[PDB]
Amino acid sequence: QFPRQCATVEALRSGMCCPDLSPVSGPGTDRCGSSSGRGRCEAVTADSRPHSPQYPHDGRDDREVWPLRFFNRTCHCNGNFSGHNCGTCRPGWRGAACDQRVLIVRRNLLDLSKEEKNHFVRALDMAKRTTHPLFVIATRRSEEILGPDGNTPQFENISIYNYFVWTHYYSVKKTFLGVGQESFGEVDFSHEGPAFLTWHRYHLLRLEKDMQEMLQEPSFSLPYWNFATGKNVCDICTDDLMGSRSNFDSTLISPNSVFSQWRVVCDSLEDYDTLGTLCNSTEDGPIRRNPAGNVARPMVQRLPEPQDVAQCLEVGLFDTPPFYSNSTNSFRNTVEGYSDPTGKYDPAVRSLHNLAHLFLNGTGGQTHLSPNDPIFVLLHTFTDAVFDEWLRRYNADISTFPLENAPIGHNRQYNMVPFWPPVTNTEMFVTAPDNLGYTYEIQWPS
Ligand SMILES: N[C@@H](Cc1ccc(O)cc1)C(=O)O
Ligand SMILES: [Zn+2]
Ligand SMILES: [Zn+2]
Ligand SMILES: [Zn+2]
């Protein structure tokens, strides 16, 4: 979503989100940091190629051809500068001139020290409470974007972690057709499609950078959760980590974990699809979690098994047609978890990433809401680690990633929704240690 600078009336009608960085001579003088060498305001590149027929309603949704329904001018930064301003560096780079290489290691959460574990938890909690310095979030769609009196832009501040929750939600939201109409649900800009891995890759990358600056610890790194242990229990659901089960309510978090204080955003789906609003920054109920607790669906009461991971890393093609949740022999669908680990589709199966989510039987198992459970972060860094080792192993072969006729949002050169500045699936489809400034301290079953 957009920087405060662009959540204006002036920017929203220029269609230009190109804020100043060091406005030496006054407003408009140093857009994208062109006083220094750092970048320029420029036309926006966005994918025009067609998408799967599954989504009929082109013309209705503001996530189509993202981000062109809100802005047609963006900053493009030079070299290894990056950021809405070109005010910072590309991932893996720091310094005033973005020429000092940095490499951070995402470790297994259970291998961290007592003080590392505790630093992580309170960082999360701090990110849940601290206002995001950059981004605000839209409470209404583009029609009512400038509010009732056409001169009050409908954006709210929001905490760092809730932004993480909100962007995921905005990408899964249903298409509003009109009051009295039934909203459209066969659309997911981040799941059931080849953008699933790269969307969630950047998602994590933006939370990590935000926490790096909130803590001002450039080396801060997001640990991972090896959820592929075949276990009957959540081995990170302890009070020093992500919170044990409440003894007063089997679906709540132990009051001795700070996460029992957290209150969720984006739970009022009935309001969003009825009135046409969007998730705002007003928190509601608490997190709901009950590992293994879904007695109604026994498939989901046990986590994936270590081989499940070893089998999916042998699926050689990244994705296969129709590039959807029912593709066979697609690595992206296998580790997403709509096929079994060998690649074989079945509408009943749930493996790997999906089954980790379902196992929680709670807030973490509902797509519009699962980031509210901070196990999400650990759940997707591990999903990303598997992605990263597939990229190492098959030499980042993006040939199977379709350029056309993926479900809308999942074409290879689609700008991933709603990240800003616009960033494509291709930009994330690279091995992370050499290109994105991070690596995984991890070993793989064989
Ligand atoms: N909804 C998925 C699982 C899932 C849940 C929440 C998510 O955020 C993502 C995936 C399923 O049908 O198995
Ligand atoms: Zn350019
Ligand atoms: Zn997701
Ligand atoms: Zn997920």
Residue 367 beta carbon below 6 angstroms from any ligand 1 atom: yes
Six token digits for residue 28 = 């408009």
Q: Which two tokens stand for residue 136?
A: 């605000």
Instruction: Measure the CA–CA gap between 292 and 234, rounded to whole angstroms.
Output: 8
Strand partners, 253: 245
In angstroms, rounded to a whole number, what is the distance separating the alpha carbons of residues 342 and 312? 6
User: What Cα–Cα distance (Å) separates residue 5 from each residue in 16, 74, 154, 172?
Assistant: 10, 12, 14, 26
Ligand 1 contact, 406 CB (< 6 A): no
CB 361 within 8 A of CB 250: no
Neighbours of ion ligand 2 (CB under 5 A): 42, 76
Cα–Cα distance measured from residue 227 to residue 236, given in angstroms and rounded to the nearest whole number: 9
Look at the chain and count its residues. 446
- The atom number, within ligand 1, closest to the CA of 338 reads 13
Q: Is 410 in the pocket of ligand 1 (CB under 6 A)?
A: no
Read off φ and ψ for residue 16, nearest 5 degrees. -115, 115
Q: Can you state the percent helix, strand and coil of the chain, rounding each to 5? A: 30, 10, 60
Spatial distance between the Cα atoms of 245 and 132, rounded to a whole number of angstroms: 30
Q: Which has the closest alpha carbon to 215: 82, 106, 126?
A: 126
Tell which residue, 406, 390, 396, has the closest CA to residue 192. Answer: 406
Tell me: cis bond preceding 91? Omega within 30 of 0 counts: no
Distance of CA 368 to the CA centre of its chain: 12
**Coil, strand or helix: which one is 199?**
helix
CB 164 within 8 A of CB 203: yes
Nearest to 165 by CA among 278, 70, 291, 12: 278
Could you give the dihedral angle defined by the CA atoms of residues 303, 104, 431 and 77, in that order, rounded to the nearest 10 degrees?
130
Longest dimension (CA), the chain: 66
Residues 266, 372 contacting (CB under 8 angstroms): yes
| Technique used by the depositors | X-ray
Residue 289 CB less than 6 A away from ligand 1: no
Phi, psi of 127, deg, nearest 5: -70, -25
For residue 169, give the H/E element and its range: helix 160-172
For ligand 4, the distance from its centroid to the CA atom of residue 197, given in whole angstroms, is 9
Using the 8-state DSSP alphabet, how is residue 200 labeled?
H
